[PDB]
Amino acid sequence: GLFDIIKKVASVIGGL
Amino acid sequence: GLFDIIKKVASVIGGL
Amino acid sequence: GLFDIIKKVASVIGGL
Amino acid sequence: GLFDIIKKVASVIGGL
Amino acid sequence: GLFDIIKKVASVIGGL
Amino acid sequence: GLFDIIKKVASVIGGL
Secondary structure, three states, X not given: OXXXXXXXXXXXXXEO | OOEEEXXXXXXXXXXX | OOXXXXXXXXXXXXXX | OOEEEEEEXXXXXXXX | OOEEEXXXXXXXXXXX | OOEEEEEXXXXXXXXX
16 A cells, blocks of 8 residues: 555564 | 555564 | 665564 | 563554 | 563554 | 663654
């Protein structure tokens, strides 16, 4: 779209 | 898009 | 895009 | 605890 | 605790 | 604690 917002997370514990 | 915001996080404890 | 705001983090504790 | 991790966010769009 | 990690973010678009 | 880590951010676009 006009702006694209992407977040990716990896964790052993507590990826929120 | 016109702006792209990208965040990648790796963690053992806590990826917020 | 016109501007890309890319961030990467690696940590044992507390990626924010 | 031994370490306290705290995150607070305010947004109009796209708070993650 | 022994260490405190505190983050506050204000945004219109995107708070990661 | 023994050490305190604090970060405050204000933005229109993209608080990371």
